[PDB]
Amino acid sequence: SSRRKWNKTGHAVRAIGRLSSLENVYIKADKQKNGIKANFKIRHNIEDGGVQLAYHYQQNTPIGDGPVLLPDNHYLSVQSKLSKDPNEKRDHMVLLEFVTAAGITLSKGEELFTGVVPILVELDGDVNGHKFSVSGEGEGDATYGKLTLKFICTTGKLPVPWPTLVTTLVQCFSRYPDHMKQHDFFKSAMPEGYIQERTIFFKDDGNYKTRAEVKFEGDTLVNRIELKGIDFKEDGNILGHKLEYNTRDQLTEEQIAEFKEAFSLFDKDGDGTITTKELGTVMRSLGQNPTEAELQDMINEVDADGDGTIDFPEFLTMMARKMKDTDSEEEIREAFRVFDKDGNGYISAAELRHVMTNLGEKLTDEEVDEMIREADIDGDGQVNYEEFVQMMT
Amino acid sequence: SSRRKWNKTGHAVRAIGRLSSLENVYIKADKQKNGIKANFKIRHNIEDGGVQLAYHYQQNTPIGDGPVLLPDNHYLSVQSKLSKDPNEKRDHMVLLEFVTAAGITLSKGEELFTGVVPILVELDGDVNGHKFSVSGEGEGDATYGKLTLKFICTTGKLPVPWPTLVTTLVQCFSRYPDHMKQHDFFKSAMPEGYIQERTIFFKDDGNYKTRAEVKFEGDTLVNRIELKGIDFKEDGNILGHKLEYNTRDQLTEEQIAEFKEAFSLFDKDGDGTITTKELGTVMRSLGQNPTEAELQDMINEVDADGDGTIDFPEFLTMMARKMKDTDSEEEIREAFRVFDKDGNGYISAAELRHVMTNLGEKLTDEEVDEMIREADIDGDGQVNYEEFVQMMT
Ligand SMILES: [Ca+2]
Ligand SMILES: [Ca+2]
Ligand SMILES: [Ca+2]
Ligand SMILES: [Ca+2]
Ligand SMILES: [Ca+2]
Ligand SMILES: [Ca+2]
Ligand SMILES: [Ca+2]
Ligand SMILES: [Ca+2]
């Protein structure tokens, strides 16, 4: 039938789009410049529909003369979230970002990034003759590939949309997994730093050319940029400000922080990933004793890059999974039974603290009492299943 | 805060459940019996909530004396869909199943399964003294790991729920990828066949013990089973028929068949998986010429078992992906532009046939006309964007 022919041809053509839709940042060595090159495309959603493509071409070279690491081909996977500060009057962007290297299967610089690192960003721009500046500050935690920053336009109104400046405004904060440590050029160039140059082509519109110096100044990682844009159309998507600010929707900063706290309970050594030993330790603490092979099978069923561990973005994907309403409810039932160790249908204060302390939290009885009090609708001093449901909902 | 503590502890406990939730069928060699062993658990949804667990223990041994293949540890991934025949008065089950081997990273028997194979299934059962029989027939297409069968209770009312009999009622039809051909015990035992024995333990209830002979009789693959159940509770979930029949919901047989037809357009050699060469061929046919490395990157971003190809269940996952309403609409825009080769905003009959013939279909002009006619709301002889949207929606 014609409708069947349409449907199947449609699927095929849509499949081409999904199969060919490279969203990752692809990195290759540039041995002749003792550095790297990258290319990728950014899809900027246009207000009221459509996308504005931005083709990125990138090259990086060391500032110092110390030896650096030149990588085999690989990529970075980026999850970004843009938001606003309700208390901020200046034109601004709040940014949360997780970035993880992958694509390859199973020293001084690395040490600089094991903890939380303060970040300063400064950009002076010229787009079609319009002069502007941006300042940003925040922190980087390369262990989880995490960035949190706030940027301000210090010259008033930004003459271009914030999302077009995201890639320009610190890939040294990417998480490189253990088996890819020898492929992290960005950290290897530290503390002296690297130069990062891009041309960014906005299709049917102008282009940005950027040059940046990324280096430590004392204990702060600093990104200092010059940007120049040319050939932009007065009422194009850029100068005409026709791009969406943030994506609809997104699991929000607060929820992510909750999942991260949960993640830390498993990631006992704080190295940014969960191993079989760590999952085993957690399960053993709650009374379950699966074998090493079983733990490996368990991790495999939710391991996306086959590295044998669950990193934070993998943890997030597992927990953000859709779930049928029936599965969701049964999962909550199973969770209740975990808390309710004696199976009497009520979570006591003693059972709550046993669970949390075993997971690796350090609560006083008074803190446990307050959690109980929060959920204890009928005031009997315990949390029944119905009360537990509300609390988890 | 207490709510934050609850939320994060909740996530952690729920994460344990999702991390530990082995759903795959785990296969290991049983060299002493010249065969294999397996174990897995099935979660049967209980009507009005809850799950009935069924712990499976399995062993298989060859019927013949010819040499067989003993595998390294691996697993089978199963997607099953139960349905009913509205025209069927007998107690019955309609079943569609895709089964794919994995878990291992990068002869006479195999040949028997390269095409569609007819299947007959017969089971004589005794559960708590209740005698019953089931007959089934259908086809297997191991190339896609696909089974399609219909089963009838030939003794009247089935004294147990259909879903509890699914695993008992032909793993020779699993798709084993090229790099795992030496690990396919099931096909290696053919045509002479194998004995398959299980004990299935239903938690807080009775157990099934099964013995089956799976072998070719002429050109038909036959599964002949004896089942005995003991210790079942009169008003347990089994004898009391308290289990859900099918899962809510599921992309339906008709949609899957459309996606399979779409898949075949890429899978030009019909070997059940899409390579970089095949995606390249398809894209080249529509005017796109990505490099081999680009095609490999493209496939990687949607490759789940890292084997470097996209099999049918991987294709389905890619196409069943959630998609934000805005992404969905832009994807349809991009698809339109593919059909509308001259960019005039209208898909002509000439443009439609060019697209379909290049994808690898063989339509007459009259068939193309009918597709146009189906979508051509305003009768101008072409398909505009609004008309295209309706057709894809
Ligand atoms: Ca760890
Ligand atoms: Ca992983
Ligand atoms: Ca209790
Ligand atoms: Ca209570
Ligand atoms: Ca193929
Ligand atoms: Ca694959
Ligand atoms: Ca046209
Ligand atoms: Ca028309």
From Swiss-Prot, chains A, B:
Changing S77F: In H9; increases fluorescence at 395 nm excitation. InterPro entries: GFP, GFP-related, Green_fluorescent_prot. Changing N207T: In EBFP1.2; shifts the excitation and emission spectra to shorter wavelengths and increases quantum yields compared to BFP. It comes from the Eukaryota. Contains a chromophore consisting of modified amino acid residues. Maturation of the chromophore requires nothing other than molecular oxygen. Changing I42V: In P9; increases fluorescence at 475 nm excitation. In R10-3; matures to the red-emitting state with excitation and emission maxima at 555 and 585 nm, respectively. Changing D30V: In EBFP2.0; shifts the excitation and emission spectra to shorter wavelengths and increases quantum yields compared to BFP. Changing Y144N: In EBFP1.2; shifts the excitation and emission spectra to shorter wavelengths and increases quantum yields compared to BFP. Green fluorescent protein has been engineered to produce a vast number of variously colored mutants, fusion proteins, and biosensors. Further generation of mutants led to more stable proteins (at 37 degrees Celsius for example) with brighter fluorescence and longer fluorescence lifetimes. Changing I230V: In EBFP2.0; shifts the excitation and emission spectra to shorter wavelengths and increases quantum yields compared to BFP. GO terms for biological process: bioluminescence; generation of precursor metabolites and energy. Keywords: Chromophore, Luminescence, Photoprotein. Changing Q171H: In P4; leads to no detectable fluorescence. In mut2.2; shifts fluorescence lifetime from 3.03 to 1.94 ns. In mut3.3; shifts fluorescence lifetime from 3.03 to 1.88 ns. Changing I46V: In EBFP1.2; shifts the excitation and emission spectra to shorter wavelengths and increases quantum yields compared to BFP. Photocytes. Changing V25I: In Azurite; shifts the excitation and emission spectra to shorter wavelengths and increases quantum yields compared to BFP. Changing D205E: In mut1.27; shifts fluorescence lifetime from 3.03 to 2.85 ns. Energy-transfer acceptor. Its role is to transduce the blue chemiluminescence of the protein aequorin into green fluorescent light by energy transfer. Fluoresces in vivo upon receiving energy from the Ca(2+)-activated photoprotein aequorin. Belongs to the GFP family. Monomer. This is Green fluorescent protein.
